[PDB]
């Protein structure tokens, strides 16, 4: 979806006075055909009859004006109503996939002038916005909220299973008993979960001001999930990987590639064929996840800790003194690393 | 529900252009009577008047055509509109349980020709599909989603209680303090939960593309429940049972038999009369559940481990060396079995 | 709500063909006035004009007949339609709180004959049923489900807080560190929760077949709550109390008395004035809750265990041999009591 | 929102007979213009034509009367209907931001007389109440419940993350390993959560009797959150702070100030610049939270315990005897403090 169109869709999103007028118009079953232009003069060839108003815009004015036949012409910044009751006459030979005079006129005019044309028919409750060669159907809030509420419920279920996987993985990691299967399973669930977020995103945007609660919920449910997945990648990839690369792995599995077990283990640098092999590959966390998330050591510095001790297993054996030999690790960091890992082992394993 | 009919129901499921036209028709309160035929020629006896169109199908075309009285005739693959405004005249002596000319005509024609006939009346918002001697009422998406959302909430509650039962059962199993009552109680909840899934299934299918989120939720909620229940059967049945048999027990209690305590304990091979006796029967898990789910040992091989040690109690006492004497158990499997069971005991009991 | 009326309300509950016809009638905005009689003959004085049909009942027939003015007369068992289009003429001097001829006629006739009279007006979507001097407004399913879904959500929140209270109480009980405040707080939440169930009950019934999922949810959420609360009463009441009495305490606090802290502590036999005193009263569980729920010892026998050891504190110190000296406690029960309590202490405290 | 207006809004809230009549009027699409006056005589200048009724008020009467053009005049206590079908004639030169004669008349009359004027138009389903220079749009219950149900779901998510933060903070506190970042993070989530409650409040009120379940849910979800946050403030502020001050911090961050990390750490008395510094500031709880919430020691007395031992760290080391040296700490309190803290350490750390 071109950003160019996104900017236009904002014009008729829940919250704006324009959308306010359009909803009223839908409820009254009157029709509407609105043409957004910067300078009316250069468009007089496609504007016939009607009335010249050149007055300030308001939702009430638009609604009343729409009781008459024909089209209304507004300024692109929706601050002025220039015409009402006019006949829009774009070139009839322009191709159109629309049905019914109102929408065919809207599409051709948008294509012809490169300007925005809004159509609202009587036999339906949806807003169609035409911009250049683009068409965007705007749904009603009730419909959007229904889909979004279901997507959120679906997310809660994925998050729950994700929390359960990560919790079990934590036990295994602390006991150094992890297998590639445990990692991939956890990654897959995470990838699939963030995929849902990406898919519902266009719905949230379309909700405008009425999607505020929905955004808040998505934020609380997927808070640190992305950071967590990256750290998992940095910790279990076959060979060392920088954060930025882990992020590319994440973005890739969120949109491009499908999060299938074999496919994830492959990108992680493991040469596997059948998913049955995953339960046989033993792996050891490097310790980034725990270092950054629990010991609160900046990644930049964790790099030094990992380069020296290699794995979480070794770091958990290190002493306060042993850890200070690391560049960037003082008394506080050293104690923080040692104590937080020891605390976790005593509680979770 | 014959699969034969299921194939026809797909034709008018949410997502198809046909359903798109039918919804529009419902919203406009126009009526509709659609007859699906392969070759119009051999049906000219039941097709009177109207107009010959022989044009490409589209939802907009169907909607417009439906503004006229009579019926529309389409190709079975919904790619062609052959007739519009015709009078369908099946044999009037054919029995019909329908009311009102439109539905009586549809049922008799479907019965007469063995073809699909779709009826949509003005005084209601539902689609009736007739195929041979079958009738399928298609509900609106709003209604379906309402029932499905309630069924999902109901499932969440059953799953929660199931998780609680399984969690307590786990403690008991690790402490070798299980009674038949603990097993049956856990099985019953599991059986009842999967029963809900089976019952809501026809609703999910009827939802078509709009049931995608619902499917995802059902999948996250009942993920490994079936495998888990089978393993429970394999572990607590009075006498050894092969997986395939455990599965038959599952399928049976999901559809045929009622998951009553006594009834489950009976099928498991225990001769009980009153539910009060269940709290008195001590039982010991064979160890399949833990072997497959936690130690990740293939069932095929677990069979060997169980045939040698008999119960989880004995396996938990076995040593790495003792376990390797089993056919198919190497150093890795042996360590995996021993360590995962020891880890669980230290954490859960 | 008299059971007598409940039986009549079933006649028009979701699921019945009668309600099916009434919903259709509501959607069409036609009106309806239905009079249910056993023998039409003895009511000819209040039945004028119309048509004698004496035909078999069906929803389609009722719906069609309702397109005409006047009333319809059916058999009490809803198997026969005796009249259609008649004028019902009860005594006009009979008092009525209704407005509009249709409802005034219905109420007076029901009062006059002691029979059921159903009225459905055009300017609204609700069914009014009149039986003798009773009036029952039947709501639409959509409305009912909305209230019921909210009540269920509200219940989930109370159950969660209840689980948290009971969980903390469990720690305290095992450590013999309980105070009257911990008990009352847990009881109050339980009482309030079951109060919600009682209040939503009339809604579930009114839902008929469409309240099946709602019932299942209420059952999963409040499963053993009543038994649990009774045992809590038996365990913390100032002086010994029999189960049956504990139950009266429960029923009382669910309907009659308000579950205020002081009020609960008072009924439990503690003479307190200000809620501040509750945190100062130390109490010890007798052990019924744990004996019945965890050790699975029948109450009848727990009575003997409590009469001998007095408190959970003492039972937890008892030996297998010490416990067998109790009448009804064998080797199994004795082991069950001892091991389950010891297991709990090792895990929760 | 002036309380003065709140009192008027109650007049038309769900539950009242007046609102009952207004809903019926909305469903019928009749219009309504109601003027509430104490003494009709002194308003005869703005009341023209119509009918003098001087009869008792009822919803049915109001609904029927509204079928006629013009306005209805009721007594301020909604117990009397004085006029029906009248022409209200306020001064036309009074400014009005309304459109359409009905609303312009209502606003001007309310402004002119300082009395309540209720307007309901045909082309919409909302009630507009005018009082003096105020205007309050009353929404339908369906709309309100939709927003409120979403706000509750959003709250559940914030509460869950809050519980997780507080749970981890608890471990850290018991191990005396807390950093300013852990405290602020927990406070921020708490502050944001209570902010949602404040924002949805006007919706709950507008729901009237239909907002009962919603209130119950908000109460169960945010129960002790405020007390908990205050205690957190009292425990981690840079320098000692009295409860009343902690409360001002809470109220401030709930409405005025934005709960940004730096902003919270600043108000707590810590001079920080970049959020990165928070992970470096070690802090120790004074012990109020644990003393009041777990040991059940009144704040008034906790003040003495803290003034003597200073931190939770020191209190956890204190002996029963050491604690009794505190003014207000007896054998019970002393044991309660010592045992509850020791119990927590053994279970959570």
Core attributes:
part of a larger assembly, 4 chains, 349 residues, alpha+beta, YojJ-like (1, Ferritin, eight-stranded mixed beta sheet
Q: What is the structure about, briefly put?
A:
Chains A, B, C, D: Its cofactor is Mg(2+). Chains A, B, C, D: This is DNA integrity scanning protein DisA. This is part of a larger assembly, with four copies of chain A (349 residues). With 349 residues, the first copy, chain A, is α+β, with helices and mostly antiparallel strands.
| CATH class group of the largest domain in chain A | Mainly Alpha
> What overall geometry of chain A do the principal axes of the alpha carbons give?
elongated
Biggest interface, and residues per chain?
A-B, 24 and 22 residues
- Report the major sheet of chain A: 8 strands, mixed
User: Quaternary status of these chains?
Assistant: part of a larger assembly
For the CA atoms, what is the radius of gyration of chain A? 29 Å
CATH superfamily of the largest domain in chain A, called what? Answer: DNA integrity scanning linker region
Structural class of chain A: alpha+beta
Distance from N terminus to C terminus of chain A (CA atoms, Å) equals: 49 Å
How many E strands of chain A? Answer: 8
Number of helices of chain A: 15
Total count of domains of chain A: 3
What percent of residues of chain A are in strands? 5-15%
Protein name (chains A, B, C, D): DNA integrity scanning protein DisA
Family (chains A, B, C, D): Belongs to the DisA family.
Binding site for 3',3'-c-di-AMP (chains A, B, C, D): 70, 88, 101, 105, 122
EC number (chains A, B, C, D): 2.7.7.85
């Amino acid at each position: 979806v071109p950003q160019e169109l996104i900017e236009k869709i904002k014009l008729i999103s829940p919250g704006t006075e324009l959308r306010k007028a359009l909803d009223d118009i839908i409820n009254a079953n009157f029709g509407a055909l609105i043409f957004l232009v910067d300078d009316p003069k250069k468009y007089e060839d496609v504007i016939q009859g009607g009335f010249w108003l050149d007055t300030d815009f308001s939702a009430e004015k638009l609604y009343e004006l729409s009781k008459m036949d024909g089209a209304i012409v507004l300024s692109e910044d929706i601050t002025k109503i220039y015409y009402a009751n006019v006949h829009l006459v774009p070139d009839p030979t322009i191709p159109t996939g629309e049905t019914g005079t109102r929408h065919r006129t809207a599409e051709r005019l948008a294509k012809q002038t490169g300007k925005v044309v809004i159509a609202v028919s009587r036999r339906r409750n949806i807003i169609s916005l035409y911009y250049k060669n683009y068409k965007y159907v705007v749904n009603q809030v009730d419909f959007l909220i229904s889909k979004v509420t279901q997507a959120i419920s679906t997310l809660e279920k994925y998050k729950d299973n994700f929390n359960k996987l990560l919790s079990e993985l934590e036990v295994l990691e602390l006991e150094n008993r992890v297998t590639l299967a445990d990692v991939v399973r956890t990654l897959a669930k995470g990838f699939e979960l963030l995929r849902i977020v990406e898919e519902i995103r266009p719905y949230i945007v379309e909700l405008g001001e009425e999607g505020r609660l929905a955004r808040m919920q998505l934020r609380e449910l997927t808070e640190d999930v992305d950071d967590l997945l990256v750290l998992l990648i940095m910790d279990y990839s076959s060979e060392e990987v920088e954060e930025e690369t882990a992020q590319n792995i994440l973005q890739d599995f969120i949109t491009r590639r499908e999060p299938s077990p074999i496919s994830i283990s492959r990108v992680l640098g493991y040469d596997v064929q059948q998913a049955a092999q995953l339960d046989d590959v033993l792996v050891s966390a490097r310790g980034y996840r725990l270092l950054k998330t629990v010991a609160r050591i900046p990644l930049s510095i964790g790099y030094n800790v990992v380069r020296m001790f290699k794995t979480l297993d070794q770091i958990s054996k290190a002493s306060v003194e042993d850890l200070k030999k690391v560049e960037g690790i003082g008394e506080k960091r050293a104690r923080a690393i040692s104590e937080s890992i020891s605390s976790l082992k005593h509680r979770k394993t």
